[PDB]
Design a binder for this molecule. Structure first.
Ligand SMILES: [O-][O-]
Ligand SMILES: [O-][O-]
Ligand SMILES: [Fe+3]
Ligand SMILES: [Fe+3]
Ligand SMILES: [Fe+3]
Ligand SMILES: [Fe+3]
Lengths: 491, 82, 305, 102, 491, 305, 82, 101
């Protein structure tokens, strides 16, 4: 006979003890552990609600990978790359470049917790979390690897995080702040709770729904399988949050969640926003970016936040307004500076698409539509010099993304600046400025790509010089319009 | 000599790096910013282009130079119309 | 300016390999971007706390090599093949548990063996958890992804051993409810003499934050000692007490431990390509050997009494 | 902002099942194991969002009968891509629930 | 350590002994075993070239099924049923009805050898063969079962072999002749050698090629996985063949192969021929039926027959002519009598398809095209009572398929008749009459469906009565034109 | 002609109370050869195979008007059989691997290799008889749910055969002078202890009535093999310090208990017809003295000098 | 009275069961076969339809009856043109 | 005519179903049969790989072309058919003909 897990599970997490040959603080130093002075005894009530055991883990994950790889193998000849819309291929390039090695970075966040969390249950679930992020990183290298021979841009599935390309810097700045650069309890709260029960669902399930509409079942099956792991190890954050609230640390827990959510929002607005409203072919848009946001972040994540005993963030109404506006301007920037991307942005402004954008965001044509009109006329007149930039955009000192606002009829743009220790910083939002002020030593001597440009670190100090600095190795890898402006035939 | 500013042009969608010179008049600054905006993402229009410190109410005199202005390198300016 | 180039058959960093890249090469090599910039390991302020930690405890390690990324797991394991392998081994172990329970094996051990297990076996869940935590630390600090990957799988194997011990402690408690099985292990780990050499060793080893010293003390000193002085003496004692399950279980764990020794020795060989590293590693080995020997001596004394 | 208020002020709990052979068995199980709850289903082709107000239970026994093959509760994680509500899981069932009412 | 197969395999087939308490002939009776008087000791030299062992079998077959089912699950929302051309859906309905319970019957053919073959290696490989056909029967019931809720015609994946529908009778008459109705050595030669290295590849790999072109990867992946099993257990036939030749029985071996090949040919000309040249949409036709025949039957199978020491069948030149002509007439019969099928035949005679037909079969338009001219004109003039029959086709007493010839400008039709025991039989070729003459006791009192109609066993004696006798339980189950005659609008 | 809507499952399952299971969908009512009493197969009604099935299936004295309602209590399909056996067989292969590493065969009590050569290695002939016999029940049984149980029982018999072949060869490597793998056919044919079994199997294999074949094989022969061969070998191996054989037999006994389970379920289904009790008891009594003779001869050989 | 034969009509693709009467003339037999072929799969044409035993060289006379023909039930006939 | 030519071939080799074994088997066929011309016919759902008279696939080369551990017995997962007679062992599979037409 076998004995049921409920009967022996407690022994697997009976692993705390009172150190005698070193101090408790030497064994769990605050800068790595983040226990906020809560003594060891209090961490033993931590109870992970989504349990697993080593025998079940290796058996179930063997079945998950067998499914993912069997589907990839059976569809190798489905002509997805050849028959897909170029904007869909661009979505794959940006996803794999932005995610794959960041997943491998998440191994280090989970490892931080496996060594330095004072909660024995957390250290075991973080060990499975380490394994899950290994899976995620290896899958999302293995899958795009077969396209290297079609397109040098898929090399950026591996190369992006090794580059100084501006969007790789934005992703690394975020993940190094939330995942690899903070103590174990911060990781539990900012990564597993805030990011992996919130925005990760936009990218791995919202995009899966678009992939299924587009007919890419290898990709949809892949990223939805990845999300099943996230659903288990993301449950490490809830009990840590509850522990901090019950030990007098509600304010600190709220601040970390507030910070983490906003940082993820700005990055996912530039990566997922353009994908869902512009790169994905119209007929394959299952919902708009805003409708997905209201499903996954407002309807699901924010409600779960309240259920755990936390409050709506202080920036709630700022966040709702950003949802209507930010990614439209991020899209325009990524497109206008497409030569700095490792994918080929789709402009996505044929009349058919402009009608859909107007229905999903009333007033779109009077705002971003005004810029796309000038761009469209220049393409129709063969003034291609007017649709490529000769300067760089100003970049947020927090998100590492260009400083944007609403263009056109009711133009409004605000930079939120900050003098700090003899340096002038510029931020794209109130909240980004606030995030900086919560932890200046984390950020104050970092230099964004434009800071480096003006400091002489980018030679020659030209757009061409920035492209060499960003790591581009051939003309083919620089981004171009996804359709080679064939959409202008529709205008 | 070189004098970098961050400039937001009326009706554009973003703030850009524009390097002007320490002795450029405000009229010369506005034209150097307009090179990166008008007929690219912003329609041309009639009227006089004015320069101001970002979000403020007062406009710099058109004849004033960057050196005579109060501006520091990398500060944010708006280029707007009357 | 820029030149036109053809697509490559593999990643740019592998395109100069003589042979076709393996699955292992594709998914494991050169993934630590935190080794690219010596001033800022992570994409934050160069003197952020975690950047300072990595510059002290990874970049400044006296164990030095100009190409740590060239390290290769001799088993070339990836996540997929690790799970394939371990699902086979772990379903074997679980089948043993099932069949030996059907046989009432625990009832037929020599009289008193349940007290030896309560004293000398069930508190191993603390030691195995220390190996798990220690392996996780070498993982996050190691300067190459192929090293870190070996450490991830070794962390999972340590939890595997912990879980074996937890399962068997509870199952043994069902036949022998009056021996403290599943009740007193923390007190034994904290207070029993035979465990204090091991607990002293791990508490100190867990506070060696230099990645090289962490690796050497864990994999070249601690883990071989556990094989020689805990695993194998336990098999001998089980044989003397008609426990036929424990020697089979330990043989499965010894398979994991030999895999850890294989990648460990491979990394040592890689590191010895730099002649300076021989003195560094020998010095750490001599520094930690006495604590390991005292640990083993005290444990073996307790197992003998 | 009133559209955002009403999106936030919900009490929907339950599983998000990815495309595969578990979608229809989980829907049937949710209906059977929660009599007197209205079960809502939103189909996004790559996944299905299954919900009820306040609490939703899936028992292993019912899921096994609706799936048509032997089934362990831990296997649900092959296809549970996300979920709304807090989770309480064991060998016999999984319960999705909220502690507060909005 | 483990010891390699080539170290203990011989002992797995050291299972022959000299019986003492019954006689060798009682243990292995000729009517069940078919040893042709070849003594037991001679059968010990049987050496299967495609070996397996129980541990490898269960492990590898576990992996095969994991892939088959996970691909099916990942593609369930690919919209195959709703979006596929109806001709492709009919191909699925025809395949599953004709094959699924026929696979389960092949378990009995394998079981016949596992018990009654005198060769020990045959008995072991037939045991894995039993398991393989169990797999194939269960896969090909499980896969169509999900479409039951959409279309009653998918019920025939289970029901066809329980009916007296005319194509079902043709399939059962063939499979009961070569699989379930003969001794073990006949099964080895006629099933595993003749059928499972010959025509099986047409249905499971030729069709898979068309399935991949059509975008149905669940079905392509399934039937190509089934073919990997057949490749192994079909290798039972060669060694039996070689043993028969070595022991003076070449003439009997040649007769059995000649008979099984012709019988399989006639059946697959009616099931696969129309699928490949008419039902499959033109753009998805990987090769013509005849091109596939020259690849799989002439180029591969008949060359393999020569290599093993047998001769080209005596009817070689009749076969080659048949490949040019027969299935075009079988298609016309199935379509004109479409109400008698459980699938919906596609006419496949739009001008674009007719150009393809003429290119692949020069002279097609002056033969079958003459008949399709008359049909097409009636459809355009809404004279629909002339596109449905008011009598029955005459049916071959061997193949159970209608008696056909070449229509149009060079009309040629021939029926080969035979009086035998006070009964007049009619056959569709010289070879079918010859097959009957090789074993009259197998066939002589069988009554084909038209024989039954005329003898009073079908009541009422009407087309309606025959349809009900054939097992149709509702109007929706009987075949219609796949496209509801929308093809006529292109003519 | 009536109109009907599509059904959720096969026509013959559409009136079940419960939702059809995988097992129901792929296993039930597949023998079309039982539909027409005068013509099982679609050939001449007096074709040789049709006469065989009319005599040995249709005319069997064991009768039931719905054999097809029979249900395997384990509800096994091909997919779940392979899942189960891949686990059990990879367990057994891991046992072979590890006991080989320990050199288990060298530590058996002196002379055990001769007892294995005489009483164990010739079981491959007995197990192959069960394989052949199971395949006959498969092809003659009147319901596909019955035949499906026989298919898996045939595969299980070959699994046992293959265990015996592997161990015969393996044992011969430690003891090359015991006739292991050389003399089994002569012992099967001439050794007194085997002749009871060989006569039983030769006569059982010539019982062509499907009902008598099923009863003699699954209710008489196979229970005797569990009780008089498997379990006494386990006891003998314990006396002789063979710790592998009892574990191997334990895995084979799981197969045998599964065969017993579906066998008993078929009897219970058959006894819905009260006439079948005397028929089954009659065949049991007819075959039992042959099986008792076989057991007595084997056991006296097993316990000999 | 009822008399089944198997009939092949010129230029058609198959043989069909056609029931005629023992006292039918060959001209009536021909019309009954043609009913199942002409304007369905065979174009109408001018000419006199004749009946013969399958692949025979001789034709049966136009006025000759089935009874007078010596044909047996279920024999194969052709219907062709002169 | 065309038929006699189709019959009188000596092409031998594996038919690999669509999946991750197609490209490694083609590469292996070329590497392990130097001096044979390898022919490949791609039917999307399967690939027909042939050489004249004999074609060898070795385990060592296949495992190297595939990029992961490989046993010869696993070839059956993707070997949907083959031309020629087959001689298989732990180290290689050989497809071959006894006669020369
Ligand atoms: O990041 O998962
Ligand atoms: O016949 O499979
Ligand atoms: Fe992840
Ligand atoms: Fe994650
Ligand atoms: Fe088959
Ligand atoms: Fe087969």
């Amino acid at each position: 006979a076998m004995h049921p897990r409920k009967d022996w599970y407690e022994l697997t997490r009976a692993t705390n003890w009172t150190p005698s040959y070193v101090t408790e603080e030497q064994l769990f130093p605050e800068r790595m552990s983040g226990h906020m002075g809560i003594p060891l005894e209090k961490w033993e009530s931590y109870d992970e609600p989504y349990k697993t055991s080593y025998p079940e883990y290796v058996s179930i994950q063997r079945e998950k990978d067998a499914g993912a790889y069997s589907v990839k193998a059976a569809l190798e000849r489905a002509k997805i790359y050849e028959n897909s819309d170029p904007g869909w291929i661009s979505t794959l390039k940006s996803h794999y470049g932005a995610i794959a090695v960041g997943e491998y970075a998440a191994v280090t966040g989970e490892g931080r917790m496996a060594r330095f969390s004072k909660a024995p249950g957390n250290r075991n679930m973080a060990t499975f979390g380490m394994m899950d992020e290994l899976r995620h990183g290896q899958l999302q290298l293995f899958f795009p690897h077969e396209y290297c021979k079609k397109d040098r841009q898929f090399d950026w599935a591996w190369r992006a995080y090794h580059s100084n390309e501006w969007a790789a810097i934005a992703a690394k700045h975020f993940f190094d702040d939330i995942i690899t650069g903070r103590d174990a309890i911060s990781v539990a709260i900012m990564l597993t709770f805030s990011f992996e029960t919130g925005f990760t669902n936009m990218q791995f399930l919202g995009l899966a729904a678009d992939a299924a509409e587009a007919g890419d079942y290898t990709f949809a099956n892949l990223i939805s399988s990845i999300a099943t792991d996230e659903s288990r190890h993301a449950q490490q954050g809830g009990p840590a949050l509850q522990l901090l609230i019950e030990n007098g640390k509600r304010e600190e827990a709220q601040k970390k969640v507030d910070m983490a959510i906003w940082r993820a929002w700005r990055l996912f607005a530039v990566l997922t926003g353009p994908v869902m409203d512009y790169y994905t072919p119209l007929e394959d848009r299952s919902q708009s970016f805003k409708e997905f946001m209201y499903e996954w972040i407002i309807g699901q994540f924010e409600r779960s936040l309240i259920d755990l005993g936390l409050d709506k963030p202080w920036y709630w109404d700022l966040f709702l307004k950003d949802i209507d506006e930010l990614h439209h301007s991020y899209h325009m920037g990524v497109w206008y500076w497409r030569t700095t991307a490792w994918w080929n942005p789709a402009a996505g402004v044929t009349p058919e698409e402009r009608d859909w954008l107007e229905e999903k965001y009333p007033g779109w044509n009077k705002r971003w539509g005004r810029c796309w009109d000038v761009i469209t006329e220049n393409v129709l007149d063969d003034r291609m010099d007017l649709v490529s930039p000769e300067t760089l955009p100003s970049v947020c000192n927090m998100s590492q993304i260009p400083l944007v606002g609403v263009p056109g009829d009711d133009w409004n743009i605000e930079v939120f600046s900050l003098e700090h220790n003899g340096r002038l910083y510029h931020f794209g939002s109130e909240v980004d400025r606030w995030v900086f002020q919560q932890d200046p030593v984390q950020y104050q001597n970092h230099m964004n790509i434009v800071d480096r440009f003006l400091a002489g670190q980018i030679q020659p100090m030209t757009l061409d010089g920035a492209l060499k600095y960003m790591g581009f190795q051939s003309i083919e890898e620089m981004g171009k319009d996804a359709h080679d402006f064939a959409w202008a035939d529709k205008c | 000599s070189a004098f970098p500013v961050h400039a937001a042009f009326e009706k554009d969608f973003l703030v850009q790096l524009v390097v002007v010179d320490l002795n450029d008049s405000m009229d010369q600054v506005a034209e150097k910013v307009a090179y990166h905006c008008v007929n690219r993402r912003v329609a041309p229009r009639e009227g006089v282009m004015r320069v101001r410190k970002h979000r403020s109410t007062e406009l710099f005199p058109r004849d004033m130079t960057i050196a005579e202005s109060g501006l520091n390198p990398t500060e944010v300016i708006d280029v707007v119309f009357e | 300016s820029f030149e036109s180039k053809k697509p490559m058959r593999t990643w740019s960093h592998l395109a100069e390999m003589r042979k076709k890249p393996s699955e292992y090469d594709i998914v494991s090599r050169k993934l630590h971007y935190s080794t690219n910039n010596p001033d800022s390991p992570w994409e934050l302020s160069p003197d952020s706390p975690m950047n300072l930690w990595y510059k002290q405890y990874r970049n400044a390690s006296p164990l030095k090599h100009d190409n740590w990324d060239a390290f290769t797991d001799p088993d070339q394991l990836v996540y997929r093949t690790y799970n394939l392998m371990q699902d086979g081994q772990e379903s074997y172990v679980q089948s043993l548990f099932d069949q030996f329970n059907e046989r009432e094996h625990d009832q037929m051990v020599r009289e008193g063996w349940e007290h030896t297990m309560a004293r000398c076996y069930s508190p191993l869940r603390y030691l195995f958890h220390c190996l798990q935590m220690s392996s996780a630390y070498v993982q996050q600090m190691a300067p190459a992804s192929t090293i870190s990957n070996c450490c991830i799988l070794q962390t999972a194997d340590s939890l595997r051993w912990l879980t074996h011990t937890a399962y068997r402690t509870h199952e043994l408690s069902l036949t022998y409810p009056d021996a403290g099985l599943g009740e007193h292990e923390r007190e034994l780990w904290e207070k029993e003499p035979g465990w204090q050499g091991l607990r002293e060793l791990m508490e100190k080893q867990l506070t060696a934050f230099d990645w090289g010293e962490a690796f050497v003390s864990l994999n070249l000193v601690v883990k071989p000692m556990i094989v020689e002085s805990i695993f194998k003496p336990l098999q001998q004692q089980a044989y003397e007490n008609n426990d036929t399950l424990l020697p089979l279980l330990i043989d499965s764990q010894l398979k994991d431990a030999e895999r850890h020794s294989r990648w460990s020795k491979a990394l040592v060989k890689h590191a010895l390509e730099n002649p300076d590293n021989h003195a560094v590693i020998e010095g750490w080995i001599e520094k930690w050997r006495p604590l390991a020997d005292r640990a083993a001596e005290a444990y073996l004394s307790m197992l003998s009494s | 902002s009133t559209l955002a208020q009403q999106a936030l002020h919900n009490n929907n709990v339950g599983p998000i099942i990815r495309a595969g052979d578990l979608v229809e068995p989980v829907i049937e199980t949710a209906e059977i194991d929660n009599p007197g709850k209205e079960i809502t289903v939103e189909d996004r082709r790559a996944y299905v969002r299954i919900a009820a107000e306040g609490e939703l239970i899936l028992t292993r026994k019912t899921l096994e009968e609706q799936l048509g093959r032997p089934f362990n509760m831990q296997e649900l994680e092959i296809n549970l891509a996300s979920f709304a509500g807090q989770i309480q899981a064991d060998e016999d069932q999984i319960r999705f629930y909220f502690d507060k009412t909005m």
